[PDB]
Design a protein around this ligand. Structure first.
Ligand SMILES: O=C(O)Cc1ccccc1Nc1c(Cl)cccc1Cl
Ligand SMILES: COc1ccc2cc([C@H](C)C(=O)O)ccc2c1
Length: 580
């Protein structure tokens, strides 16, 4: 009857306001903060009004109608948001869909540097404004961030400024925390963007399948029934959030978290610490909970899925339940597999039964079906061992460079910053995963990879440069990682013409902190590969190392610029002979 009243009542004012700010910040990334505060308070006041009389004029309008009307009042409409002023001409649900379509994955706003004195001051002087501003900035930059979860991260950014601001050295307490949080923010944005990307490109079925797999791994004690129910609910939550209905999403998420904690005895024995928490902390804990111990009573799958004579019938009767079942069972006995691998396996099963069940004698045909799985498992296992050996041996930086090269050879049309960012992200998978026990590295690796390759793909949607990437991004959610692995030097490349200034470093680099130095040299590394695509990886390691030494020494010098000026051109000219 009054959606706005109903969400204001279930969520409470704090989480209601927060979520409406987040939603606004994502729909209008370019709109200044103060403009959004007033719109939030404005809509929020209306909610209150409606909550006390749901018959009041306009209280029965859809959320969209109310929210889109609010956004379409924001000043400097056409100048600041060109393409979004056209959306305000529309009725809902066209209008909502045009907003949604014009969200910007790489708005490329200033990097968020902590100002610890000036922010503690703003924290103590007005914490609501201060926390609000954090939601705004993160939302702004990650327009598909998982709404309820951002409020959770806003609670940790509060806990942080709370403990460090009263302290002696605010900047020493606060900076490593705010760095850890940014890392968690980025990972979380990447997981949610993979969810939204899967809806957009593959549909709701592909999200269900993914979620059956992962929840079955996580909750192996649970019966198919119960995973199905959680998955149906979880898929609706994320569909909503992804489509921007953040208030609905949060409300539904809290009901799901209630449910799971109502039923943990029949879901998992790890939900116990999670269930003794406030709403946001609990939902978060459930969402990241460790995998439960395997049960002693796991069935043998062979009889039911490869030996049974009734398999084609069972399968023509309800494919999706038969397949969902195989996926649930295979998944829960395999936490040591990646989600994507589990889904390639299911897709091979399904394929084997469609081929075999139309054949002359199907059971002889599907008898060996589990053996089709074996090379699918060997492949990413080998990859992971091979990349972790490399990592263990050369370290993060060089492993990142190995990858910058590998990827620049595959898609040398990608801008340098993208290639650098993706090789760096990929190399950090190295860091996180290679150190885990031997049976956790394949899932760690391939699950985090999926996150990074989706980032790449999302960027490429905005700024398309390469048919090879378009193909790999669209052909199969489960096949992405193998599709990217199989890519080799684009022979279609005409080498990029040499511009000396691109390889030419100056004293400006010596100021930069360590990460920012690497980004520069890694940027030159990408550029080296674009001019000389056939250069071997060892030739580029030596040329890069000679650029490192060169930079280390000239930065170490009494006259930095005369050092760069004298020695730089020699190194630019000679290092082109050392490549191809
Ligand atoms: O690139 C690889 O796959 C591994 C490899 C093997 C031998 C020598 C160098 C590299 N990788 C690599 C590259 Cl391509 C550039 C800079 C530094 C390093 Cl360690
Ligand atoms: C364990 O650590 C890694 C890190 C990066 C990787 C990148 C790739 C890409 C997809 C590639 O094209 O080979 C594969 C495996 C990887 C394992």
């Amino acid at each position: 009857k009054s959606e706005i009243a109903h969400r204001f009542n279930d969520l409470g004012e704090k989480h209601f306001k927060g979520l409406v700010l987040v939603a606004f910040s994502q729909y209008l990334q370019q709109c200044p903060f103060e403009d959004h505060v007033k719109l939030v308070n404005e809509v929020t006041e209306f909610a209150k009004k409606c909550a006390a009389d749901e018959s009041a004029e306009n209280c029965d309008k859809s959320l969209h109608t109310l929210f889109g009307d609010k956004l379409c009042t924001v000043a400097t409409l056409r100048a600041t948001y060109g393409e979004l002023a056209d959306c305000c001409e529309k009725q809902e649900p066209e209008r909502n869909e045009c907003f949604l379509t014009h969200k910007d994955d790489h708005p490329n706003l200033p990097k968020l540097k902590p100002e610890p004195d000036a922010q503690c001051a703003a924290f103590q002087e007005d914490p609501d404004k201060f926390l609000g501003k954090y939601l705004y900035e993160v939302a702004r930059r990650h327009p598909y961030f998982y709404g309820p979860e951002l409020l959770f991260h806003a609670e940790e950014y509060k806990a942080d400024f709370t403990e460090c601001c009263p302290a002696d050295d605010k900047a020493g307490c606060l900076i490593p925390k705010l760095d850890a949080l940014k890392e968690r923010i980025l990972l979380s944005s990447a997981k949610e963007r993979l969810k939204c990307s899967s809806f957009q490109n593959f549909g709701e079925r592909a999200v269900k399948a993914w979620s059956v797999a992962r929840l079955s791994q996580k909750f192996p004690k649970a019966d198919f029934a119960e995973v199905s129910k959680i998955v149906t609910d979880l898929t609706k939550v994320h569909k909503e959030c992804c489509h921007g209905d953040l208030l609905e999403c949060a409300d539904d998420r809290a009901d799901l978290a209630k449910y799971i904690c109502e039923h943990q005895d029949s879901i998992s024995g790890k939900l116990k610490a999670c269930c003794d928490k406030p709403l946001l902390q609990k939902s978060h804990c459930i969402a990241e909970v460790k995998e439960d111990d395997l049960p002693s009573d796991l069935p043998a799958l062979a009889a039911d899925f490869a030996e049974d004579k009734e398999i084609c019938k069972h399968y023509k009767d309800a494919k999706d339940v038969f397949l969902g079942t195989f996926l649930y069972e295979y998944s829960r006995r395999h936490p040591d597999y990646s989600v994507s691998l589990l889904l390639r396996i299911a897709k091979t099963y399904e394929a084997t039964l469609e081929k075999c069940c139309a054949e002359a004698d199907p059971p002889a045909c599907y008898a060996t079906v589990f053996d089709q799985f074996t090379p699918l498992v060997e492949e990413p296992k080998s990859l992971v061992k091979k990349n972790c050996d490399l990592f263990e041996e050369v370290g993060e930086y060089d492993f990142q460079n190995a990858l910058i090269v590998r990827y620049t050879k595959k898609a040398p049309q990608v801008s340098t910053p993208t290639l650098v960012e993706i090789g760096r992200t990929l190399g950090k998978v190295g860091s996180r995963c290679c150190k885990l026990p031997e049976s956790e590295r394949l899932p760690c690796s391939e699950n985090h990879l999926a996150l990074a390759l989706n980032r790449l793909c999302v960027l490429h949607e905005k700024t398309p440069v390469s048919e090879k990437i378009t193909k790999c991004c669209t052909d199969s959610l489960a096949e992405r990682r193998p599709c990217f692995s199989a890519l080799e030097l684009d022979e279609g490349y005409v080498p990029k013409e040499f511009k000396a200034e691109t390889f030419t470093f100056h004293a400006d680099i010596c100021t930069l902190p360590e990460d920012e130095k690497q980004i520069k040299k890694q940027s030159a590394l990408a550029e080296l590969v674009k001019h000389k695509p056939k250069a071997t990886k060892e030739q580029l390691k030596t040329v890069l190392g000679n650029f490192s030494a060169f930079v280390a020494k000239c930065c170490g010098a009494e006259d930095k610029e005369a050092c760069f000026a004298e020695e730089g051109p020699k190194l630019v000219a000679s290092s082109q002979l050392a490549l191809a």
